[PDB]
Amino acid sequence: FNITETYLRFLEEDTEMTMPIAAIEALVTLLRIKTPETAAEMINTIKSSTEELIKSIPNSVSLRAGCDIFMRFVLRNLHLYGDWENCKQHLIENGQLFVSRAKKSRNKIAEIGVDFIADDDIILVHGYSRAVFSLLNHAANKFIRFRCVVTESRPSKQGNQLYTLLEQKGIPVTLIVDSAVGAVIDKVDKVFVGAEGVAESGGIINLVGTYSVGVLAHNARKPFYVVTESHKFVRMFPLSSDDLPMAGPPLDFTRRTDDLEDALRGPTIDYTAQEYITALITDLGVLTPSAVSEELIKMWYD
Amino acid sequence: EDRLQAVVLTDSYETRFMPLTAVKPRCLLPLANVPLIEYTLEFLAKAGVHEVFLICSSHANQINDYIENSKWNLPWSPFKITTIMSPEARCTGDVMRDLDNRGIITGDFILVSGDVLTNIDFSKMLEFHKKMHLQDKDHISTMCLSKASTYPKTRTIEPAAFVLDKSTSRCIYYQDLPLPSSREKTSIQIDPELLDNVDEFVIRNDLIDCRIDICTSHVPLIFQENFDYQSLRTDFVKGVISSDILGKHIYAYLTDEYAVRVESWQTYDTISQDFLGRWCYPLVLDSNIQDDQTYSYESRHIYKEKDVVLAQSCKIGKCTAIGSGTKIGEGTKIENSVIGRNCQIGENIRIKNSFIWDDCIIGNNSIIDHSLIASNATLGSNVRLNDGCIIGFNVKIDDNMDLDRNTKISASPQDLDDQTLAVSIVGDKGV
Amino acid sequence: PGISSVIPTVLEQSFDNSSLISVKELLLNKDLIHPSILLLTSHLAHYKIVGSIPRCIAMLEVFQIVIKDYQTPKGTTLSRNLTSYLSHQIDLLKKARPLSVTMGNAIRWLKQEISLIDPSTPDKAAKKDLCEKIGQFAKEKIELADQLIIDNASTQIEESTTIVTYGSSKVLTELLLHNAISLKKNIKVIVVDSRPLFEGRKMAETLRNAGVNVMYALITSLDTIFNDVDYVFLGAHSILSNGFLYSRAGTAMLAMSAKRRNIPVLVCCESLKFSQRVQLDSVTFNELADPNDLVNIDYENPVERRGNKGALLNQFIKERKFEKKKLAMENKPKGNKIGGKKGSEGESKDASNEE
Amino acid sequence: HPNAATSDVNVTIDTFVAKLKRRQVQGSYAIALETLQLLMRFISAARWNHVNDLIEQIRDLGNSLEKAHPTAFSCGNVIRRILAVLRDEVEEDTMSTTVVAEPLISSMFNLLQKPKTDYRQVAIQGIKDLIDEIKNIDEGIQQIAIDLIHDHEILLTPTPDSKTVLKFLITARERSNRTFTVLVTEGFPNNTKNAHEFAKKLAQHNIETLVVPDSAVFALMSRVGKVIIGTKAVFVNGGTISSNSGVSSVCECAREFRTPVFAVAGLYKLSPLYPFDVEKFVEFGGSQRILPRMDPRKRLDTVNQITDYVPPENIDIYITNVGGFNPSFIYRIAWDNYKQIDVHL
């Protein structure tokens, strides 16, 4: 029936259906066909489909995290030894209810996380997450004064994409390069970030230059922010500064070339430690330091 | 106390090294890319020698020319070298009688058989020799000893068991045993003439021989008197103890620090690994004694001289030394191995625990493991070697060659397999 | 009853927070104490191998022996003079060597088990089930938990890697043995050691017996060995409610250097190792030992020299004091491996509330 | 130039070479004294009549001396010191033989503007002044140094090997108005014996002595007032090579705790050479003193180093006979005593 193909169908869609929430909705559809009455036939085939999904993954982390929460909810269903049928109907229904919860959470955060941006504050924003930009838009809806500084992130050129999406709103902007990002931290009140994942330790899984931002801000004593939707938690503990799950290059040094083809190769995803984050924002209240681990301990019961 | 003369026993342990000592002499061979004599001469200079004697007969011309080129023919040297020329191959007793007939021995003289590297200060030794000589008149020679490498379970070539005094440090018995190498004999018989004179008997096999001697003017007179004594340790020491002349004493000196005499190939290998390690605190490559030496210490026990050339993306190991004017290609692993001066090395070559002397070219794609190579010898492509495989002088091993454990190769163009010329007995060739 | 007061060396102007005294050679004692306790106290007084983890395992086994030797009196019941006898054990242990945290959690478990079983059941039926439960407790909380640390570390360590270690922790020895033999990697293991005891030497010896590429080093020679290293493993003793690492001697020095020289610090721990007591510096509560171990010019352990040092009492102020159990700063370590898999050090008391 | 010309006239060249290589000569102070007496013998005995041929010969002799022993910086500096004293008096002499020469100050910029006598006597007296300078450094230190340390302050000390520092500490303890507690790191593989003699001489004078193991340095750093270094050689960038073991970590420990770092040295101890790499400059020790038995030493590849290096990022003051200077200024003190050409001999 396929799950990778269902995820590939979301091309011109996105924005509303968040990348993990669309993968979770795809997991529920695959579950509801071949009877969730059996726990040997279904769960094993769900595990095989997640393994097939991980094997097809090039540079995504959040899809593995979202699977875990689904699994957890499924197991928790019939924890009351309830009827093998009303528990099943509640499990199938919690697929569309899971996607509907992404809207309700965004409604919560955009009213909570506008408080952090005070009267007339210049912001240097890095990365693009649907939660951080929704704060930025619904603060403009709240009629609050804020300036914006764009970071030239280099994955699939994200800075230019961010700049254009800020133009459509009506907020004054200018391009700042990630090389010169050190020379900006004096005319900037606060530094904001959108994460691809949040660590078990309390650190962050992010883009092509975020640790560098974290350290410079720690030097300048200027605050460093992480805002996300509460589903990007993996049981992952990157022990060192340069160790992450990869399908491509972990720093490759190429031979002598004349035509100039083999060059680009650098760490596209980088980790930053727990100390560098001043504040973290999700729908699960306002919490930062040891909070992430407590969430993971509560979920995994281990 | 001043004015000290020394005699060096060379042409003594030849052919004990089986494939070598064919064209060039015993002591010319380098330990750490530098001749064995140079170590001994440095020990002489640190001791305080004013006059040096050397015993050369076989390949004597090459020895004399090397002394001509040496740092001691020059007037500023504290000692002057005079060579003794004798008939070809004779025992130590025969040379002792020759020197007594010539008559140059004055007071206390020095005799060393074989070449020994030690960090032990000799000034303490001389004082304790003199203090014990003042104790009683009829006192003869001094012997050096050091504490053994853990237990001598791997040491079979030196099975010398010493019986010593706790109070006076006088030797009583000398005995050799095969034991773990050849399980045949068990018994050791001791003379009971010396029981109550000593009382505090201490029997030890856990001591390494040195064969370094401080000797009185009595010694050459005794050698001429008793011309039956050929050796200096096995028969001579035992003969002195067992009431030859009544009331005569010989010393045995205990030292905690490193002192090992070179004799065999696998002993030579251990001493070399000890030198690469920091076992001999003064005797290290970086200090540079031969003056032409420009070695520099690097962390993790890696030695490099000046003008060391190496190809990028190459891994070096632990306890390694590389000479001057040396080139190395890509994909090379050098682990616990010595490579000489002016040695060109090809590509994709894995070396572990091996040995290479000066001016040696190695062919591409070859693995060498715990095996020795002599000077001006070339290795071909696709060469695989095993443990204890010693390769002689000027030996040209051609492309595609495999040799098993302990496959010794002759240095002269007789009885053992593989010779010097192209394709060495892999298809009948050789003079 | 025992020997108390009268101590060797000066009272000392700086650092006087803990007891510096005790019985090494047996003179005047009660004739009721079980000899396995007397053996362990004589062991721990001059011990070279143990470091936190094995000390409790031995303490458990000694307790198992006592219960096996225990026969209930006809007049007095099981919970009558047992708890007094155990209090005599701890007091004798305290005199010999200050207890670990894991030892305290064991005693607390045992005292809970005494209250759980009422004096009504037959005596031989009681102790037979008790030792079975202790064995299962030792299985779960040590052996099986240790194996869980092993596999957690296995995923964490990269292929062909250099590791610098310290101490004589049971968990780390088995860790490295698992790396060398069962997994078969290129692991360069460098071991460091201090002066009071040769913990690292013993670990290196055991690693040599396995056949590992081992460098052996000292604290003085650190700024040369680093300039190579990828991971640093520390032998845990106790992590507090703060998140501070209360461990052995040359630990924090290493931790500091590592943090400054980019490469992280890792700590393997047990769920029994955590405590609810709190401190922030090394001065707070220290495991002090007699300068008698530091008199000799080291090399091995017994050499007996006519050296330079000798007098401590008669000398006009010459405090040759050393500590054993020190503190690492909180931010510096990064990973902790336990019964609940993983968790950073800033999350310390997520085990104490989970129980 | 070789020693073929100087053999019968000068013999003491080769005895100093022998003293370096086998390490019969010990301590930078002693190495300097010997090289002074060498140059004393070189001028008193030789016949030259020409000046430029003489100076370049001295340069070659110094070049060979530093190649003979790399850790003898005090050897290299003393020659370089006399070389510059010579060069100034020659440049003064050439101005009189030809016949504004005084712009403002004594600067640099040698890339801008272009250009029988008692010269030998000046060379003689120049050696004599160097000796007297090396003889008396402590008097010049005590007037700057014993102004910075307070009552009830605890002093931690790596490298107890220096004769200079111990004598600085004893002059401060002589002042009855000054009280301080002394912590001493042991420095196990080398300094041990010297550290124990250090602790003995402090008790002899009745100063609160505290012997510290090299592990316990961290366990005290919260309580430490100041850190003092017994350096062997000081450099251009500021950094020091010290007399062996357990300094670098202590300095790293101090900087993290923001505890001040002091250094006691001489200008002859100060070097105009630059430490581009520690790898070349630091001398390594003998592993024999660590671990016995050679059959396990096949597998026990132990690492030990004598000399320890400190980067300039840690230390703040270099109190000499002249005065106290910051590491970001010490280069000028060096160039005031040694010329730019007198580096690459």
XYZ file of C-alpha atoms in Angstrom, chain A:
302
model
C 0.000 0.000 0.000
C 3.124 2.218 0.552
C 3.974 4.939 3.103
C 7.004 6.615 1.423
C 4.859 7.255 -1.699
C 2.107 8.869 0.447
C 4.717 11.214 1.990
C 6.092 12.012 -1.514
C 2.608 13.180 -2.636
C 2.964 16.263 -0.380
C 4.905 18.592 -2.736
C 2.852 21.776 -3.319
C 0.876 21.211 -0.066
C 2.942 21.463 3.193
C 2.706 24.496 5.636
C -0.506 23.242 7.347
C 0.360 19.526 7.228
C 3.689 19.647 9.106
C 6.313 17.114 7.875
C 6.042 14.762 10.902
C 2.218 15.177 11.256
C 1.822 14.078 7.595
C 4.031 11.027 8.260
C 1.992 10.192 11.416
C -1.262 10.522 9.384
C 0.324 8.158 6.811
C 1.114 5.695 9.658
C -2.551 5.696 10.814
C -3.886 5.053 7.258
C -1.527 2.048 6.856
C -2.684 0.763 10.291
C -6.465 0.959 9.658
C -6.574 -1.252 6.503
C -5.090 -4.626 7.571
C -7.005 -4.880 10.933
C -5.533 -3.407 14.186
C -7.217 -6.290 16.097
C -4.030 -8.405 15.804
C -0.906 -7.131 17.578
C 1.508 -9.626 15.975
C 0.452 -9.098 12.330
C 0.120 -5.296 12.461
C 2.892 -3.963 14.786
C 5.630 -6.023 13.053
C 4.531 -4.718 9.616
C 4.405 -1.145 11.017
C 7.984 -1.675 12.291
C 9.067 -2.948 8.837
C 7.500 0.108 7.137
C 9.308 2.507 9.525
C 12.576 0.630 8.813
C 11.881 0.997 5.058
C 11.221 4.712 5.676
C 14.545 5.184 7.569
C 16.410 3.406 4.710
C 14.835 5.857 2.198
C 15.690 8.904 4.396
C 18.541 11.166 3.091
C 18.813 14.009 5.704
C 15.652 14.018 7.901
C 15.493 13.295 11.656
C 11.936 14.271 12.751
C 10.202 11.374 10.906
C 11.901 8.853 13.240
C 10.752 10.892 16.272
C 7.177 11.065 15.196
C 6.969 7.320 14.722
C 7.946 6.712 18.427
C 5.083 8.921 19.780
C 2.583 7.091 17.514
C 3.828 3.713 18.765
C 3.612 4.918 22.366
C 0.004 6.088 21.921
C -0.984 2.770 20.297
C 0.474 0.757 23.222
C -1.174 3.084 25.781
C -4.613 2.628 24.241
C -5.361 -0.836 25.601
C -3.447 -0.293 28.802
C -6.785 -0.389 30.710
C -7.434 -3.925 29.313
C -10.500 -2.463 27.636
C -12.725 -3.864 24.898
C -10.556 -4.962 21.932
C -12.875 -2.943 19.699
C -13.648 0.654 21.401
C -9.932 0.974 22.108
C -9.256 0.217 18.418
C -11.841 2.796 17.206
C -10.208 5.431 19.445
C -6.783 4.535 17.947
C -7.906 4.946 14.305
C -9.686 8.246 15.145
C -6.531 9.653 16.852
C -4.953 10.071 13.384
C -7.118 12.956 12.173
C -7.224 14.160 15.808
C -3.389 14.161 15.813
C -3.282 16.511 12.787
C -6.060 18.650 14.367
C -3.829 18.948 17.473
C -1.109 20.655 15.364
C -3.561 23.535 14.745
C -4.603 23.788 18.435
C -0.963 23.847 19.589
C -0.107 26.613 17.073
C -3.126 28.551 18.459
C -1.632 28.169 21.964
C 2.023 29.099 21.217
C 1.312 32.197 19.043
C -0.421 33.795 22.063
C 2.175 32.588 24.629
C 5.378 33.261 22.650
C 4.595 36.857 21.649
C 5.340 37.954 25.244
C 9.098 37.404 24.747
C 9.338 40.040 22.022
C 9.187 43.336 24.005
C 8.624 46.992 22.999
C 10.888 47.818 20.021
C 13.407 44.965 19.829
C 15.731 44.159 16.924
C 15.728 40.424 16.231
C 18.286 38.284 14.374
C 16.339 35.221 13.208
C 18.029 31.988 12.063
C 16.526 28.899 10.421
C 12.875 28.369 9.486
C 10.332 26.550 11.658
C 6.535 26.941 11.329
C 6.284 27.821 15.053
C 8.829 30.697 15.077
C 7.430 32.407 11.955
C 3.877 32.018 13.343
C 5.049 33.936 16.421
C 6.469 36.624 14.114
C 3.244 36.914 12.071
C 0.792 36.890 15.000
C 2.860 39.548 16.790
C 2.377 41.759 13.691
C -1.321 40.848 14.070
C -1.032 41.993 17.718
C 0.347 45.329 16.378
C 3.748 45.149 18.128
C 6.980 46.927 17.107
C 9.918 44.700 16.050
C 12.815 44.828 13.573
C 14.167 41.772 11.707
C 17.639 40.624 10.578
C 17.962 37.767 8.051
C 20.765 35.180 8.315
C 22.243 33.782 5.102
C 21.879 30.075 5.858
C 23.232 27.741 3.138
C 21.382 24.415 2.803
C 19.073 24.783 -0.194
C 19.471 28.599 0.196
C 17.168 29.207 3.193
C 18.021 32.863 3.863
C 16.572 34.005 0.509
C 13.467 31.873 1.139
C 13.039 33.412 4.617
C 13.579 36.960 3.248
C 10.819 36.547 0.624
C 8.340 35.179 3.206
C 9.062 38.215 5.431
C 8.391 40.568 2.463
C 4.857 39.132 2.076
C 4.044 40.247 5.650
C 5.164 43.881 5.883
C 8.203 43.918 8.198
C 11.523 45.752 7.290
C 14.467 43.420 6.576
C 18.094 43.201 5.346
C 20.469 40.336 4.411
C 23.189 39.363 6.863
C 25.802 36.708 5.969
C 26.621 33.913 8.473
C 30.336 34.843 8.188
C 29.644 38.386 9.412
C 27.037 37.220 11.958
C 29.544 38.005 14.740
C 29.595 41.701 13.703
C 25.836 42.038 14.262
C 25.595 41.110 17.963
C 25.447 44.649 19.434
C 22.563 46.136 17.433
C 20.566 42.913 18.047
C 18.358 42.536 21.139
C 17.600 38.824 20.797
C 18.606 35.819 18.654
C 15.937 33.298 17.640
C 16.209 29.751 16.195
C 13.945 27.056 14.763
C 15.148 23.490 15.407
C 14.989 20.218 13.429
C 15.190 18.342 16.744
C 15.791 18.803 20.476
C 18.175 16.478 22.317
C 17.735 14.158 25.313
C 20.575 16.108 26.967
C 18.895 19.472 26.349
C 20.902 20.425 23.263
C 19.749 21.071 19.696
C 19.674 19.333 16.310
C 19.795 22.078 13.641
C 21.031 23.394 10.263
C 24.307 24.424 8.533
C 25.320 27.057 11.164
C 23.584 27.168 14.569
C 26.206 26.116 17.109
C 28.352 29.015 15.778
C 25.385 31.330 16.509
C 24.976 29.833 19.997
C 28.575 30.376 21.036
C 28.840 33.963 19.718
C 25.650 34.846 21.584
C 27.126 33.268 24.725
C 30.139 35.550 24.274
C 27.976 38.651 23.752
C 25.611 37.548 26.607
C 22.655 38.186 24.252
C 19.747 35.711 24.551
C 19.384 32.624 22.368
C 15.974 31.183 21.515
C 14.523 27.843 20.352
C 10.846 27.687 19.328
C 9.105 24.538 18.033
C 6.004 22.329 18.032
C 6.153 19.561 20.686
C 6.792 16.413 18.616
C 10.494 16.839 17.732
C 11.978 14.824 20.595
C 14.100 11.737 19.876
C 15.901 9.468 22.333
C 19.154 10.754 20.802
C 22.282 11.754 22.731
C 24.978 13.254 20.432
C 27.985 12.791 22.744
C 30.379 15.007 20.827
C 30.149 18.278 18.894
C 30.521 16.518 15.502
C 28.540 13.228 15.699
C 25.163 12.749 14.048
C 23.144 10.193 12.023
C 24.082 10.683 8.344
C 23.511 9.074 4.934
C 26.075 11.328 3.202
C 29.442 12.859 4.169
C 30.956 13.156 7.681
C 33.742 15.536 6.444
C 35.461 14.169 3.301
C 38.807 15.358 1.925
C 39.099 14.980 -1.852
C 42.035 14.410 -4.216
C 43.668 16.907 -6.629
C 41.159 18.059 -9.280
C 41.359 20.438 -12.289
C 37.799 20.432 -13.701
C 36.491 21.496 -10.226
C 33.586 19.196 -9.262
C 34.326 17.682 -5.819
C 34.361 20.570 -3.292
C 31.174 21.474 -1.296
C 31.480 18.783 1.372
C 30.922 20.121 4.895
C 28.775 19.151 7.980
C 25.246 20.203 6.970
C 23.712 19.386 10.380
C 25.444 20.591 13.565
C 24.878 20.127 17.304
C 25.011 22.714 20.104
C 25.203 21.962 23.853
C 22.645 22.607 26.575
C 24.358 25.683 28.052
C 23.964 27.883 24.964
C 20.151 27.877 24.967
C 18.696 30.634 27.191
C 15.054 29.879 26.424
C 12.903 27.160 24.780
C 9.275 27.463 23.672
C 6.688 24.744 22.898
C 2.943 24.217 23.526
C 3.847 22.081 26.562
C 4.212 25.179 28.738
C 7.172 27.532 28.991
C 10.259 25.402 29.750
C 13.918 25.057 28.723
C 16.648 23.253 30.623
C 16.004 19.769 32.115
C 12.459 19.876 30.741
C 13.080 18.025 27.497
C 14.546 14.994 29.312
C 11.647 14.871 31.766
C 9.270 14.787 28.784
C 11.242 11.875 27.278
C 11.422 10.009 30.627
C 7.617 10.461 31.018
C 6.991 9.102 27.492
C 9.436 6.151 27.385
C 8.802 5.154 31.075
C 12.513 4.196 31.277
